[PDB]
Design a protein around this nucleic acid. Sequence first.
RNA 1: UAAGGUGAUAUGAACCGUUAUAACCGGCGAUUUCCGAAUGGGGAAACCCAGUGUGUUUCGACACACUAUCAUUAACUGAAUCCAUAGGUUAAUGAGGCGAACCGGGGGAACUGAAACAUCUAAGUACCCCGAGGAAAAGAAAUCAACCGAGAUUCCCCCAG
RNA 2: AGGGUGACAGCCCCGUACACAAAAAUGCACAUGCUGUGAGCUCGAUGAGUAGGGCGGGACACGUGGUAUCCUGUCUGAAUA
RNA 3: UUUUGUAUAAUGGGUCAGCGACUUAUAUUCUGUAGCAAGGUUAACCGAAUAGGGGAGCCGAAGGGAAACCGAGUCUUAACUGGGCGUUAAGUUGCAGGGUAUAGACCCGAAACCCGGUGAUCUAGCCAUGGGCAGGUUGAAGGUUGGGUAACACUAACUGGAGGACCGAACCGACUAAUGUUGAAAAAUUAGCGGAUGACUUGUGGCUGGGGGUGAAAGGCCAAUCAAACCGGGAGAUAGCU
RNA 4: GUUUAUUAAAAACACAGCACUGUGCAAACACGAAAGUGGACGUAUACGGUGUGACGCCUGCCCGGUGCCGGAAGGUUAAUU
RNA 5: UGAGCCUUGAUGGAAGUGUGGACGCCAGUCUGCAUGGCUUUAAUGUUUGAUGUUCUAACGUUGACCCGUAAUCCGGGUUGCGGACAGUGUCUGGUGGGUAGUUUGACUGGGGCGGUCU
RNA 6: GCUUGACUGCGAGCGUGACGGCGCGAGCAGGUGCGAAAGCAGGUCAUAGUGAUCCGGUGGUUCUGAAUGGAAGGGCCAUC
Lengths: 77, 50
Amino acid sequence: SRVCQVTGKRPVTGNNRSHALNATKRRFLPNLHSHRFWVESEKRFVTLRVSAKGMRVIDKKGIDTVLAELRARGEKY
Amino acid sequence: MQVILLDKVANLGSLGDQVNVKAGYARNFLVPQGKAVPATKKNIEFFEAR
RNA sequence: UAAGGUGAUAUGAACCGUUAUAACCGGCGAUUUCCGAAUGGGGAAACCCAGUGUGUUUCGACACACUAUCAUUAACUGAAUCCAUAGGUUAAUGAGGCGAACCGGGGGAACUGAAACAUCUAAGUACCCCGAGGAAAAGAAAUCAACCGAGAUUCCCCCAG
RNA sequence: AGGGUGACAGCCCCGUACACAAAAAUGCACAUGCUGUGAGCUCGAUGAGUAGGGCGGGACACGUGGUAUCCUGUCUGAAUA
RNA sequence: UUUUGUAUAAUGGGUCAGCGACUUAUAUUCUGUAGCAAGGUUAACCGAAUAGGGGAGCCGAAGGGAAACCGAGUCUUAACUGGGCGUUAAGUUGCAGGGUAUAGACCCGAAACCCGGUGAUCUAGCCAUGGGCAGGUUGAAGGUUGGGUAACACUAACUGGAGGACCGAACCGACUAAUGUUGAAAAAUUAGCGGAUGACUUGUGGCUGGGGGUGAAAGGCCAAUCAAACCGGGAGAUAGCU
RNA sequence: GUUUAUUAAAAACACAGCACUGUGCAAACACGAAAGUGGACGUAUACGGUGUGACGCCUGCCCGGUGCCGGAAGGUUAAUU
RNA sequence: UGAGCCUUGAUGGAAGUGUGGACGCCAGUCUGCAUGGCUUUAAUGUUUGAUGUUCUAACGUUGACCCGUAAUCCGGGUUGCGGACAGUGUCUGGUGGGUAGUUUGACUGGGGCGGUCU
RNA sequence: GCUUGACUGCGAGCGUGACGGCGCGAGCAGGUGCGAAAGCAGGUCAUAGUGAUCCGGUGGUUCUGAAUGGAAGGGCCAUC
Ligand SMILES: [Mg+2]
Ligand SMILES: [Mg+2]
Ligand SMILES: [Mg+2]
Ligand SMILES: [Mg+2]
Ligand SMILES: [Mg+2]
Ligand SMILES: [Mg+2]
Ligand SMILES: [Mg+2]
Ligand SMILES: [Mg+2]
Ligand SMILES: [Mg+2]
Ligand SMILES: [Mg+2]
Ligand SMILES: [Mg+2]
Ligand SMILES: [Mg+2]
Ligand SMILES: [Mg+2]
Ligand SMILES: [Mg+2]
Ligand SMILES: [Mg+2]
Ligand SMILES: [Mg+2]
Ligand SMILES: [Mg+2]
Ligand SMILES: [Mg+2]
Ligand SMILES: [Mg+2]
Ligand SMILES: [Mg+2]
Ligand SMILES: [Mg+2]
Ligand SMILES: [Mg+2]
Ligand SMILES: [Mg+2]
Ligand SMILES: [Mg+2]
Ligand SMILES: [Mg+2]
Ligand SMILES: [Mg+2]
Ligand SMILES: [Mg+2]
Ligand SMILES: [Mg+2]
Ligand SMILES: [Mg+2]
């Protein structure tokens, strides 16, 4: 699934709305990318499926405390 | 993405200073290859009392 | 609890009982084939075939137990690569399927109405999917008020078409 | 009350009013034993990729309207008694 | 019944029996009737449960003005000699009823749109694996051998056995006609007809699913259904029409 | 040879041949929210698409329109800022 | 290489041997070149973009090899190629009968065409 | 020739329309013009020369102003 492993972001539904205001179901899906992180804390490389922002979080919180969640939460990785 | 340095490093290198880099350069080279660490406010006194 | 019983269509046969183990009613046990989540593998549901264990003064082959998958945990093993992780084995626990409505959530119509029809309506309805309880949900103010005050959530009648 | 009994039964039958009943197993109160869990006082602490914003949508009776308020797919991003 | 008008040769009914179409909830106004009356009445709820309480509230006794506001007046305009709307007439709550609104709103009736499922045991195309084609003709390339050339080319006999080749059964098809048309048959029978070693034909199994499949293309075919299958659901869709 | 199973077998469809065109391979293209799969375990003497339709002689004039291919200059022009 | 500010440019030991520029309607025989008691013209530091080169270290790999593993999936590892391009997300202009919902009047000596509509 | 009565606020009472509405109007209030004056003038000899509501623009306006003063927005008047 198109789900960001660190924030939990997934596709949402909405409309399109033409000038004539016609509603058409659509999806806004998240900006996944799946990036290879360096942990050091495990002398290993972790490939996560990550949303931008997800990345901005890992940058802020720090991978180690992020990977602390996930395990704490259930995700493989 | 601010971060503090370790070894020298190009047009900012100073063994424990508060430089400001582009997030990419950081979390792809500088950190992965042991040359810096983000300015997470914990770390800002490990390499600021030198 | 009892003088009558052996469910029914449904007679009869052969019987069981009458002062406490006939039968009847209730509680707890027992046994509980095969299929079905089906769970040893397979499979055209109720069948086909295995591994490892047991088992026979007729210790052959057949009969019986266990052997699914995933998760958490533990033990032992253990690559590229030394460490280490991956992998692998086992052990204990747990999940799985089912079910009337009520409930929360992920998705989400069109007829139709507008006297046509696109915005709008039907309607977050119908339907599909995940999940839970005996109820669910919501809930202890970053709420209202109007300078006076009130004090979580929930339901009801007003406010008010 | 009601049902039944060879036509319509308070007194024929089963009941009904009324009064009692559990060896077991259990639903529910309290009470304790066991298991795990913490109560109490002192000094502290007070929820950041968040609030807010730009873009797109969606929720609020409220159709972007002068439109507050809530949610966020996207790019950003504070103060901190 | 429908109509300007129907014995009508316009509609409907073979007959009988049975069922079969203006309801219900809540709003709202009017009429009737009843209680009380410048007042009438409670709602949820409590409940000693049709009582009793509960007056939160609603309607009315004041209107005029968009409004601030003023008030038996008010608005209008700088202002009315005026003009508009008011002042003079009882209200309100039950109960029965005539309308209205929201609802399927008198009953039956579409062709259709959307949603979820069920169908490739018919048929279309593909996949894999098995089978069938009596009998009779024609005589390609090639070869051999003679003639023939400097040698080839050429030529004749013979051998050879090609082909969406030829005739014709099985087998596959469907051009004509008659019969049949409440059939023997929801497409057949009879006599003729086309192909019949092929782009042939056939058994078993598999795969493709509904705005989708498949289609040597006809809008053909996808279970006697096809310009959007069948089944269930939104559903009592809507029906200014009969 | 194919076709309207069930009123149309034909002159309709297919066809070998011909031409234009796309396509350098993770091909074009098609099924598919995706992974993937067919194209093809093929590679421009290949594959898709379109039209024509054995074979013979042939296939003239028009690029204004519409489409397609190419066009680094100028005018108009989006989010953004 | 586009653009402000700090600036490398000037804002309200005298006199000698004294020779290129200055937008100067239409060229100042003056200064050094060795010497004598907080700006139009641009460029150095930038914060910030445009373009081009090169890099690798994100990202791609439907090249090769190694292990999980007797496995054309997948994963990891090493390397080669590629490389901040590609691709994807959000936003956005174009195209868009590929698909979808609909519209496409009434009168009328039948309807259409014509004509008409205040 | 001189002018701005093609004026502003109103309007007894009539006409004509299913309605929306349209039309005729003496007179009153204010202010103006022509005339010596009585008087005439609320467009044009008259009967076509037109477009409802909604949405919004411009000006004016103490009318409103979601705690209060404001402001936005709304109303009323004129007009597009
Ligand atoms: Mg089994
Ligand atoms: Mg099984
Ligand atoms: Mg309609
Ligand atoms: Mg809760
Ligand atoms: Mg207070
Ligand atoms: Mg707090
Ligand atoms: Mg008639
Ligand atoms: Mg009549
Ligand atoms: Mg008559
Ligand atoms: Mg008739
Ligand atoms: Mg008749
Ligand atoms: Mg009462
Ligand atoms: Mg089939
Ligand atoms: Mg059929
Ligand atoms: Mg033949
Ligand atoms: Mg023949
Ligand atoms: Mg035929
Ligand atoms: Mg004949
Ligand atoms: Mg025949
Ligand atoms: Mg046709
Ligand atoms: Mg109907
Ligand atoms: Mg309906
Ligand atoms: Mg033929
Ligand atoms: Mg036919
Ligand atoms: Mg043709
Ligand atoms: Mg070509
Ligand atoms: Mg269409
Ligand atoms: Mg429609
Ligand atoms: Mg007509």
